[PDB]
Amino acid sequence: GDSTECSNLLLQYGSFCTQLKRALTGIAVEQDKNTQEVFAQVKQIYKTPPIKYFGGFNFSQILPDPSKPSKRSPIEDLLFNKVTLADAGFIKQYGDCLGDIAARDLICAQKFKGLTVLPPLLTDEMIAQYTSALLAGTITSGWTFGAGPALQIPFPMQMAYRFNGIGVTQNVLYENQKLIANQFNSAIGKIQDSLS
Amino acid sequence: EVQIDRLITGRLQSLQTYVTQQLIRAAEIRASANLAATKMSECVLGQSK
Amino acid sequence: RVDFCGKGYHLMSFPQSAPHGVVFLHVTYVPAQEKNFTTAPAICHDGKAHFPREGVFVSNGTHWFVTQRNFYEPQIITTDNTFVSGNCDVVIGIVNNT
Amino acid sequence: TRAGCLIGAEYVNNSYECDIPIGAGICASYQTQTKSHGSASSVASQSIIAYTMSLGAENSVAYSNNSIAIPTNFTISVTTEILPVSMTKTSVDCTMYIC
Ligand SMILES: *[C@@H]1O[C@H](CO)[C@@H](O)[C@H](O)[C@H]1NC(C)=O
Ligand SMILES: *[C@@H]1O[C@H](CO)[C@@H](O)[C@H](O)[C@H]1NC(C)=O
Numbered sequence: 001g002d003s004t005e006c007s008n009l010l011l012q013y014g015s016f017c018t019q020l021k022r023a024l025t026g027i028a029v030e031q032d033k034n035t036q037e038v039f040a041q042v043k044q045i046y047k048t049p050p051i052k053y054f055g056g057f058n059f060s061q062i063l064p065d066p067s068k069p070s071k072r073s074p075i076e077d078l079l080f081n082k083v084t085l086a087d088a089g090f091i092k093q094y095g096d097c098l099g100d101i102a103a104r105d106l107i108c109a110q111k112f113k114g115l116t117v118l119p120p121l122l123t124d125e126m127i128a129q130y131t132s133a134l135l136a137g138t139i140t141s142g143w144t145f146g147a148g149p150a151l152q153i154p155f156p157m158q159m160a161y162r163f164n165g166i167g168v169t170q171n172v173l174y175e176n177q178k179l180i181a182n183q184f185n186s187a188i189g190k191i192q193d194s195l196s
Numbered sequence: 197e198v199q200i201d202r203l204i205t206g207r208l209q210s211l212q213t214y215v216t217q218q219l220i221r222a223a224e225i226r227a228s229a230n231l232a233a234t235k236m237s238e239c240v241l242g243q244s245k
Numbered sequence: 246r247v248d249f250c251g252k253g254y255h256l257m258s259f260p261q262s263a264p265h266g267v268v269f270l271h272v273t274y275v276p277a278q279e280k281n282f283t284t285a286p287a288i289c290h291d292g293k294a295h296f297p298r299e300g301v302f303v304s305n306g307t308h309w310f311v312t313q314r315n316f317y318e319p320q321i322i323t324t325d326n327t328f329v330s331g332n333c334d335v336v337i338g339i340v341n342n343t
Numbered sequence: 344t345r346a347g348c349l350i351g352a353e354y355v356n357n358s359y360e361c362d363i364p365i366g367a368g369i370c371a372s373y374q375t376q377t378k379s380h381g382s383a384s385s386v387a388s389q390s391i392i393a394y395t396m397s398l399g400a401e402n403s404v405a406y407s408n409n410s411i412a413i414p415t416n417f418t419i420s421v422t423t424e425i426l427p428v429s430m431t432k433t434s435v436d437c438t439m440y441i442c
């Protein structure tokens with residue numbers, strides 16, 4: 001606590017605090033490494049094209065929403081609301097830094113006990129930006145953006161490639177392109193319904 | 197001083213156990229995150245056979 | 246496996262011992278110097294749809310070729326590198342060619 | 344910044360790659376700028392600047408429903424992956440250490 005009397009006895013036990021703090025700092029930098037390795041697999045941010053016709057496929061629930069303040073996708077919005085949010089280390093001049101959304105405000109209490117939660121190096125806004133860049137590369141470039149320069153390709157062509165990659169002749173994909181698009185849209189809708 | 201020493205030992209053991217369980221579940225999270233990076237590379241950045 | 250033996254298309258790897266560890270010299274292939282072309286999903290000829298066997302259809306503006314998906318090398322589209330399967334109505338975006 | 348208060352570093356609207364992660368996308372760096380027109384290796388003020396992280400060059404992939412990109416050349420890259428294998432095996436004489 002706020003006591004030097006205990007601290008004098010505390011330092012007698014050695015560099016145990018040094019080890020504990022080093023372990024926690026390693027854990028935190030490892031979390032940063034985890035986020036960077038999962039999301040920051042590219043160093044170019046790709047802009048989603050304005051016209052979003054992709055051969056009948058519908059990515060509205062996964063592409064970013066321009067009207068949303070945070071530009072999160074509807075599916076990402078569902079995932080954001082459903083999960084019981086913790087704190088993210090934000091600050092809104094509230095005294096308690098960030099405003100937790102009526103779920104786990106007790107983090108403020110956890111702040112008082114000589115402890116805090118550190119914000120991620122990538123904010124959820126720029127994490128979503130990385131995710132949007134990955135999605136735009138996948139939709140536009142395919143797999144090529146991960147092995148060097150991004151090489152644009154129409155989405156039905158990438159679907160033909162993915163068909164060929166599982167031992168199914170890609171011509172089938174073009175003979176039932178509309179069926180595949182409809183099944184994908186329905187499956188995304190059912191994903192939303194199941195998650196909600 | 198004796199009672200504070202006892203409480204320090206108890207809280208230090210609690211913190212040490214917390215840090216070790218965080219290390220274990222952080223190794224678990226790191227395995228899951230290496231799996232997630234592998235899935236990003238082979239499922240999102242490519243097609244995995 | 247993508248990005249398992251280094252970024253890019255992994256060609257080979259060489260081990261090198263180091264104090265308490267190993268260093269892999271991941272010899273990988275990386276593409277560069279890209280050119281943009283006009284592409285089609287299939288070629289409509291004689292009322293039937295031809296799909297490339299192994300590559301992809303590109304056009305520099307006036308002529309249509311089929312190239313390998315990872316290295317630019319135009320080749321004249323023939324029956325040896327394409328297969329006919331279907332009819333010229335279902336393919337959304339088919340392109341007349343020879 | 345959302346992580347807290349930064350003193351001694353000047354905020355810069357330009358964005359570079361992260362060097363010293365401060366937090367919430369904000370990074371610090373020791374930069375050599377000629378704004379003060381003073382010495383080359385030492386500016387009149389503190390050279391510690393803070394900036395929003397540049398996630399990368401904002402490339403715009405030229406998507407079109409009939410456009411493709413094909414690479415004409417290549418580079419044979421030799422990167423280096425370092426894997427720890429075996430830590431130094433250690434023996435502790437329990438009796439000699441403790442007693
Ligand atoms: C291709 O061009 C735009 C770009 O996406 C698209 O909206 C349109 O429907 C397509 N037009 C044709 C003729 O294929
Ligand atoms: C395209 O090809 C078909 C047969 O391959 C032919 O009937 C048609 O006239 C051609 N042109 C157009 C614009 O469809």
Ligand SMILES: *[C@@H]1O[C@H](CO)[C@@H](O)[C@H](O)[C@H]1NC(C)=O
Nearest residue numbers: 304305306307308309310319
């Ligand atoms: C396309 O390639 C062919 C290959 O011989 C060439 O004859 C033609 O001039 C090229 N067209 C353009 C616009 O470069």
Ligand SMILES: *[C@@H]1O[C@H](CO)[C@@H](O)[C@H](O)[C@H]1NC(C)=O
Nearest residue numbers: 276277278415416417418419
């Ligand atoms: C490909 O790039 C290499 C660079 O290592 C260059 O020497 C070579 O001339 C290039 N090839 C062509 C056909 O431009």
